[PDB]
Amino acid sequence: TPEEKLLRAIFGEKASDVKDSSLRVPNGVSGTVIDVQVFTRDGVEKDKRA
């Protein structure tokens, strides 16, 4: 909208076309990661980590 635009004009930001959906640890629970699994569709390219 308005002043938002104005603001982006002053600070020169490229505000993204991509929203952040990332999985983050639920609030208040604290622990150590003991394992990770990655399931992939049969036919989609596996990412680097996987």
Binding site: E3, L6, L7, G43
Partner: protein, 470 residues
């Protein structure tokens, strides 16, 4: 008794109707032929029904229409059409001038050549409608002239019909019957200005239509009769054949439409089947109607049985897709990969995912979730379209921040910046526009803006506006 459940109050109601005998079908069909042909002939005997067709063809070759919107073919192409119409016009231009005892034999043939034309149903409907409307027009003057005598001027209808029949146009009845010294005679003088002036349209009809008020009623009366006969017979046939409709509709049961919905759509199919049927081909009406009823059913289901309506070819595609898996289910002793059926099928092959997804039906928002408790699925659907109060506050604050800041600059810089953006004003302004309202116009404005922003860009100031970036 009646258990309600309208399937019953239907089944029992149709269950009375007797199955047609083989010959009876021909009886009914013949009745249909008689009935229709009556209205066709009554249309042929109408002069305006001829002249109209003439003017319409004159509109066709004048490029104000197309040959498909007038004729659905004759018995029998465009050149052939041109000459056929030439034939019709010819019989018209002879019959027209013969209206001096002998003409009748030619008028009958005019009817014949007119009968050679298969009109678009819409055109036919227009014709018949126009005729009956003309009869409404006649009824107008008839009831006006009747009521202006009997109800108003106090005259018996018994003696009113006497000088009526056979003329009802000229002044033989109006100006020669008032002097008869009847109790109702001298009374007719008070309305005389109203009757004779409305008589104009009445005699005008015999000019337009080219028929005396006598025949105008006769013709479309016969027409009405024929129409009645037709509808009567056809109805009879449909009511006779409902059992077939039900028997077919029992195949389509769980496709996502109600039983009675099925049988009703199928009933409409049967109606159409009766409408377009011809016994002269020797094709059994049973096996001919089966296709039509099945068509109404299948074509109806695909259309209306979904909360999300989908095109027909799509539905067909989906069905095929459901088959391939039947060949290959046990064949790939799991199920065929989501990408396999893709190569089976003719089309691009990533379309499987899309099509497969779109074809799914929505879930009842009342679908009970755990505990059997009143928590039901829809209760868990959050509003993602609402804006959080936590943000709304910050917006209302941004208004104050920017207002303060533009209150800090020079009023013309503040005006230029408030202008350059939609700030507390409608739309926002093209820099040219900004020039014109300023009268200082061009490259110029942008300079200020740049520096304006520049002033706001480093602090006292930016600190606040900067904190707003997350």
């Amino acid at each position: 008794g009646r258990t309600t459940d309208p399937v019953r109050m239907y089944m029992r109601e149709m269950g009375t109707v007797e199955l047609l005998t083989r010959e009876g079908e021909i009886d009914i069909a013949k009745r249909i032929e008689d009935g229709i042909n009556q209205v066709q002939c009554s249309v042929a005997e109408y002069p305006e029904a001829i002249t109209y067709l003439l003017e319409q063809y004159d509109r066709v070759e004048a490029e104000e229409a197309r040959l498909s919107d007038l004729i659905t073919g004759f018995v029998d192409d465009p050149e052939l059409a041109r000459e056929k119409f030439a034939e019709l016009r010819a019989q018209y231009v002879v019959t027209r001038d013969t209206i001096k005892a002998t003409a009748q034999e030619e008028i009958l043939k005019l009817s014949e050549v007119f009968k050679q034309f298969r009109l678009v149903p819409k055109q036919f409907d227009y014709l018949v409608n126009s005729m009956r409307v003309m009869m409404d027009r006649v009824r107008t003057q008839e009831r006006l002239i009747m009521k202006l005598c009997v109800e108003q001027c106090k005259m018996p209808k018994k003696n009113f019909i006497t000088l009526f029949t056979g003329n009802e146009t000229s002044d033989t009845w109006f100006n020669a019957a008032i002097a008869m010294n009847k109790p109702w005679s001298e009374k007719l003088h008070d309305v005389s200005e109203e009757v004779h002036r409305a008589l104009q349209k009445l005699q005008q009809i015999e000019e337009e239509t080219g028929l005396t008020i006598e025949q105008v009623k006769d013709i479309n009366r016969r027409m009405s009769i024929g129409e009645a006969k037709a509808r009567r017979a056809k109805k009879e046939m449909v009511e006779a054949n409902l059992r077939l409709v039900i028997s077919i509709a029992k195949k389509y049961t769980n496709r996502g439409l109600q039983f009675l919905d099925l049988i009703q759509e199928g009933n409409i199919g049967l109606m159409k089947a009766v409408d377009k049927f011809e016994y002269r081909r020797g094709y059994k009406f049973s096996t001919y109607a089966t296709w039509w009823i099945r068509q109404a059913i299948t074509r109806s289901i695909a259309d209306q049985a979904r909360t999300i309506r989908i095109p027909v070819h799509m539905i067909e595609t989906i069905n095929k897709l459901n088959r391939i898996s039947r060949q290959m289910l046990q064949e790939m002793g799991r199920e065929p990969t989501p990408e396999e059926l893709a190569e089976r099928m003719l089309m691009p092959e990533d379309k499987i995912r899309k099509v497969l997804k779109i074809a799914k039906e929505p879930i009842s928002m009342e679908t009970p979730i755990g505990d059997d408790e009143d928590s039901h699925l829809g209760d868990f659907i959050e509003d993602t379209t609402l804006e959080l109060p936590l943000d709304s506050a910050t917006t209302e604050s941004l208004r104050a921040a920017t207002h303060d800041v533009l209150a800090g600059l020079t009023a013309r810089e503040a005006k230029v910046l408030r202008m350059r953006f939609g700030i507390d004003m409608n739309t926002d302004y093209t820099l040219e526009e900004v020039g014109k309202q300023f009268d200082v116009t061009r490259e110029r404005i942008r300079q200020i803006e740049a520096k304006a922003l520049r002033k706001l860009r480093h602090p006292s100031r930016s600190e606040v506006l900067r904190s707003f970036l997350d």
